Amino acid sequence: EEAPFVIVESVDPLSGTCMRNTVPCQKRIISENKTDEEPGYIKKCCKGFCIDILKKISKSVKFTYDLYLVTNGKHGKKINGTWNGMIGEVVMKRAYMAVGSLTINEERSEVVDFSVPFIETGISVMVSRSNGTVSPSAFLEPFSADVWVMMFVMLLIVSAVAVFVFEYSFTIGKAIWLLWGLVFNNSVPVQNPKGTTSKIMVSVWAFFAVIFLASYTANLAAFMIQEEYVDQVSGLSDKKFQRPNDFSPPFRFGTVPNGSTERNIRNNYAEMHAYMGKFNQRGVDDALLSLKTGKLDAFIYDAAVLNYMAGRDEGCKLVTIGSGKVFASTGYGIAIQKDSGWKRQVDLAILQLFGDGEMEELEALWLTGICHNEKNEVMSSQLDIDNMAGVFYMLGAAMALSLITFICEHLFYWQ
Amino acid sequence: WVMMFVMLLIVSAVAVFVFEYSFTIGKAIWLLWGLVFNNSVPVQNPKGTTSKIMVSVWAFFAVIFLASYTANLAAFMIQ
Amino acid sequence: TLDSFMQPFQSTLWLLVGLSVHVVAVMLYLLDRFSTLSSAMWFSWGVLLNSGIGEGAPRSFSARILGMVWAGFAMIIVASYTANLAAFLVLDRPEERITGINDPRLRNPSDKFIYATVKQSSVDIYFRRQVE
Amino acid sequence: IVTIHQEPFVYVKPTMSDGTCKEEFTVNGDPVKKVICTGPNDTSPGSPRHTVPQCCYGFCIDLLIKLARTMQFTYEVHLVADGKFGTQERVQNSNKKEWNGMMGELLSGQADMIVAPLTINNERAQYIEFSKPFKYQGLTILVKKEIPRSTLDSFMQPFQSTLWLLVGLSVHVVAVMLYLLDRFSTLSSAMWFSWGVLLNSGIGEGAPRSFSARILGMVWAGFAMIIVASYTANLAAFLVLDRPEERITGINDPRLRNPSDKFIYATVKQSSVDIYFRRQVELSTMYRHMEKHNYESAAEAIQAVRDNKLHAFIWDSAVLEFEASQKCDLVTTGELFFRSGFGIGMRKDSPWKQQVSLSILKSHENGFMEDLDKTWVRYQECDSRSNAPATLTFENMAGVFMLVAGGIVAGIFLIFIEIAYKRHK
Amino acid sequence: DSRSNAPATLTFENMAGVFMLVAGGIVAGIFLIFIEIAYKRHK
Ligand SMILES: *[C@@H]1O[C@H](CO)[C@@H](O[C@@H]2O[C@H](CO)[C@@H](O)[C@H](O)[C@H]2NC(C)=O)[C@H](O)[C@H]1NC(C)=O
Ligand SMILES: *[C@@H]1O[C@H](CO)[C@@H](O)[C@H](O)[C@H]1NC(C)=O
Numbered sequence A: 001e002e003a004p005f006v007i008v009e010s011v012d013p014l015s016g017t018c019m020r021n022t023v024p025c026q027k028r029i030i031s032e033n034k035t036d037e038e039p040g041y042i043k044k045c046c047k048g049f050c051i052d053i054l055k056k057i058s059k060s061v062k063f064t065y066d067l068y069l070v071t072n073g074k075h076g077k078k079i080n081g082t083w084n085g086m087i088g089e090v091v092m093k094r095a096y097m098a099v100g101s102l103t104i105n106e107e108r109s110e111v112v113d114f115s116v117p118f119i120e121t122g123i124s125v126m127v128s129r130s131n132g133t134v135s136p137s138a139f140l141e142p143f144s145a146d147v148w149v150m151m152f153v154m155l156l157i158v159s160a161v162a163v164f165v166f167e168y169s170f171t172i173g174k175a176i177w178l179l180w181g182l183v184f185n186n187s188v189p190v191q192n193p194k195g196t197t198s199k200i201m202v203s204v205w206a207f208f209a210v211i212f213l214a215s216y217t218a219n220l221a222a223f224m225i226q227e228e229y230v231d232q233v234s235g236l237s238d239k240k241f242q243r244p245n246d247f248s249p250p251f252r253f254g255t256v257p258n259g260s261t262e263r264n265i266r267n268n269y270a271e272m273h274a275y276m277g278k279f280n281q282r283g284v285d286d287a288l289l290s291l292k293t294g295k296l297d298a299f300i301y302d303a304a305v306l307n308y309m310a311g312r313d314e315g316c317k318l319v320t321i322g323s324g325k326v327f328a329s330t331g332y333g334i335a336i337q338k339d340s341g342w343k344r345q346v347d348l349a350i351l352q353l354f355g356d357g358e359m360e361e362l363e364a365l366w367l368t369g370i371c372h373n374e375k376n377e378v379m380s381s382q383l384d385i386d387n388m389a390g391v392f393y394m395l396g397a398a399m400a401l402s403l404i405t406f407i408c409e410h411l412f413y414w415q
Numbered sequence B: 001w002v003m004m005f006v007m008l009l010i011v012s013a014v015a016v017f018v019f020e021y022s023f024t025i026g027k028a029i030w031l032l033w034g035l036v037f038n039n040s041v042p043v044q045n046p047k048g049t050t051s052k053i054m055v056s057v058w059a060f061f062a063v064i065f066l067a068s069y070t071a072n073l074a075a076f077m078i079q
Numbered sequence C: 001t002l003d004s005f006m007q008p009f010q011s012t013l014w015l016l017v018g019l020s021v022h023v024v025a026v027m028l029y030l031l032d033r034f035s036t037l038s039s040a041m042w043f044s045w046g047v048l049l050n051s052g053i054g055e056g057a058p059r060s061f062s063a064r065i066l067g068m069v070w071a072g073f074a075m076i077i078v079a080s081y082t083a084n085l086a087a088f089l090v091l092d093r094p095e096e097r098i099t100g101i102n103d104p105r106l107r108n109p110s111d112k113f114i115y116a117t118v119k120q121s122s123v124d125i126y127f128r129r130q131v132e
Numbered sequence D: 001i002v003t004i005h006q007e008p009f010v011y012v013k014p015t016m017s018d019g020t021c022k023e024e025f026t027v028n029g030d031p032v033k034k035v036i037c038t039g040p041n042d043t044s045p046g047s048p049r050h051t052v053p054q055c056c057y058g059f060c061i062d063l064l065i066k067l068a069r070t071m072q073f074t075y076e077v078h079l080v081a082d083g084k085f086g087t088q089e090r091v092q093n094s095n096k097k098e099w100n101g102m103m104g105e106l107l108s109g110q111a112d113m114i115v116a117p118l119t120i121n122n123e124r125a126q127y128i129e130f131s132k133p134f135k136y137q138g139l140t141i142l143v144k145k146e147i148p149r150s151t152l153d154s155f156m157q158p159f160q161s162t163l164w165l166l167v168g169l170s171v172h173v174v175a176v177m178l179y180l181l182d183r184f185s186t187l188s189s190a191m192w193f194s195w196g197v198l199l200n201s202g203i204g205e206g207a208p209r210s211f212s213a214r215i216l217g218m219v220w221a222g223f224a225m226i227i228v229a230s231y232t233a234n235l236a237a238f239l240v241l242d243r244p245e246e247r248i249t250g251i252n253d254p255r256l257r258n259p260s261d262k263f264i265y266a267t268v269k270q271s272s273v274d275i276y277f278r279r280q281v282e283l284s285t286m287y288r289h290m291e292k293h294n295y296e297s298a299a300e301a302i303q304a305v306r307d308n309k310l311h312a313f314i315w316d317s318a319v320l321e322f323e324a325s326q327k328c329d330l331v332t333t334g335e336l337f338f339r340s341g342f343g344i345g346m347r348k349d350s351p352w353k354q355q356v357s358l359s360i361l362k363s364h365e366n367g368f369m370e371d372l373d374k375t376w377v378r379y380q381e382c383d384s385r386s387n388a389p390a391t392l393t394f395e396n397m398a399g400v401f402m403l404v405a406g407g408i409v410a411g412i413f414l415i416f417i418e419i420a421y422k423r424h425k
Numbered sequence E: 001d002s003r004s005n006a007p008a009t010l011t012f013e014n015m016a017g018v019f020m021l022v023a024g025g026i027v028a029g030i031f032l033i034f035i036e037i038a039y040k041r042h043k
């Protein structure tokens, strides 16, 4: 039993059995080790995705079946060179066939024989969604250096020609100071000349300055309305994973053990496993619950169930990195005892569903969610210091330039 | 807007009380009105020292208010 | 509509800009001393709030450049403030909207979601008769 | 080996006189493995169809090299004669049915391994037993997108010519009204008192003493502020709204669901997409329109789409996406359907089946396939979304820059007029 | 009302937040004037 593929639920107490569109799945219960009673069994009935696909294949091939849940063990890890769980049971000829979530790799394929995959998945990660937007230097986004230097040179030229007009106590510093103060919302208080043509020129400059400012605010606001949300971690080769201890208090991320994900990550990267050695978690539900309370920063598991779980949780506060980039993409399958004639038959029968298109409707019915991955990007708010540090950096640079220029001028006038 | 008008009235009365301890009620209302719309119109300064503190908060109010009006307006037009 | 002065900004920004105003006033006083003491703060505050108050611009050159950049800062601050206010003002989450009969909310009901109709009506006949 | 080049899995280029082609260094300069192919020259039938030697390279050849080195066998590749994937077709009105294309090449003695973009379906799984796929994919649709509106002029965009005139008349009208009020109970000063407050700039010290005139000015200041705010809001609202596009949703689009005389689309001849469309009974209504307009190969179809002759193209998702991000005049849209990966084809009796099927998973698990994907697929190019928030270019600056100079020359002319006026008095 | 986007005009929730500040400034004005005259007369 596994949540998005095979679901088990109690039978109807009044009728004595459960609803239709389902098949019974007998369940074995454990007993006291002192004296085991006669093997007890409890009638349960299982419904889901793989169960329905099995029901379709069985009618297509016209054979009967009787399925039962596994007593002990997950999908299976090797101990003492011997298997447990479903993959262990299929070897001992008691089951002869398996169905459900079972990732395909080389170790399991070296024991039993598989069928062509009918779903795509792999290794993926998810992180909580940070509130705000990545806008480091948004004030530089509007305009470009070309217009910034062009307006400098234009104001220099107009100030020079204004001084030339004044030739035929308007000084040179006051002339440029007036225009520079006036271009920025007429904030600075200055003194004005007594020349009519100079008045016309400064009125034209004021027209230009006003047109400027409104465009700049609208361009910046528009731009903000269109902001892109980018995940913090680029991928599995990011420095935030390989070098975990040097950035900040170390991240809180872990994997569920006794799984194919741990086996895949062990051989590729051992030090990561050494770090995981203390941050394991009980199960999918516990990890999903703990993600929201800040106890964990990242989570690694099979992408097939995470993609479903993202769109089913209340709200859309949980996302996945990038475009759902799967790592080491493999597919689920149907385990079959080695060297059996039914393998080719069932493999050819399952491919028949590709052409008919029934599986597409089936999976749209059984797997469609609510949330979207199309960059919702709700809003940035509160304008944290990190969002606008560059302006204060420029202010500090201007202060340093002012002090060094004052020292240089004092030295020049000292001699 | 009636709250705006009564605010101008009460601030003008407070300014007169300040001046008790060529500023007149004719130019005080002119200044209070002008600072609302970006202080475009030239005006006569208040010589009193505390009058500057009295009007600085009014200018702060005016700029906050003004910005909000533009901003809100953009949204309204966009929808 | 939240708090007018707290919706787009945190307090830390207010304290930081106030400290910047004070330190730039001190710097203006230092430049004036090296080459009015009570007028630097008035100049800074008038530039910050676009007030009609004003006594006199500094006479030094580097003081003029510093005043220019200080005047430049406030325009960026106020423009960002408006822009942030708007975005906030126009984007509202569309959550909790059932599309209809094909919504996966209804096709796979959960315990936290409850819905029902009036017994012995056309709805009961329509639902019971269909076999899917 | 028998293999074709679609877009990215095999590249075909002529060799030099020496009998090979000079190596092309990678981005880091690493060598690019190649191999001497023996394939037909040209494409169109009726040419001097005599074989020539040439060199090949791509995302698939290096995988073949790795497979050969791991399993220790030699090879000698050669391309296909007809350049078609191949499917069943009854010929000569006889009882027996025989394939053509790669199907015939592998099924009768000609080849041993098909290492190419081969799709897995029921028909080809009957006569060939495949291997585990190395790259999943699907089917998408290719369309063309239209350039949106420009940034326009500084003044023309948010205001049409009809205004400006009325505000220019009204400012002088109110100036005249103020002058008349002053005269009844300084005429030049009123013009500045009006123009400066409109322009948000301080000029002069115009302080009228009339009660009514002061009221009128106090009223007009708000009008000026409203005009400025309305202009800003107009430009901001226009600068963010985008023109909606068609962006055909997919196989459920009504345009694809029934034939139209202003919407033509096609697919390459005799391939798996044709089998998928023909096999199903309900999809005949558009297959019937498709069968009269099919083309020869994808190397010709994508060239025709740019030249405005096809409104759609149904083909592989991977190949289309690779050529969707390389040339940004074309955009891919829709959702994947008929999801089935590729594979390596074998006859039904060979240990190479098992050995290759194990080795391909071995190489797939340890990230080598991701390295190949980064090397040959994900270099990417111009892909500037669809809304594309546009930084305003010279378009805005040119007009204002020209005005500044026009104002300067008008100012010097008015200066000459000023000396004239001074002489006149 | 109708529609979905619902662009709503602002109300007194915005007004009172700044009316409190302006009223506080006005009421503190007299105290600051008293402090100012005391400091001017004492020195
Ligand atoms: C992973 O598998 C190991 C297999 O040894 C589990 O360890 C045993 O779990 C059972 C379950 O109750 C305990 O009774 C044993 O005492 C455990 N053995 C040891 C040596 O600790 C482990 O619990 C499994 N973990 C998960 C998350 O399934
Ligand atoms: C493996 O088997 C040996 C005996 O054959 C036993 O002592 C050991 O505990 C086993 N290991 C595990 C992990 O059960």
Ligand SMILES: C[C@]12C[C@@H]3C[C@](C)(C1)C[C@@](N)(C3)C2
Pocket: A185, A213, A214, A217, B038, B066, B067, B070, C078, C079, C082, D232
């Ligand atoms: C250009 C503008 C746009 C909006 C914010 C500013 C600060 C700048 C004040 C204004 N009146 C409204 C004019």
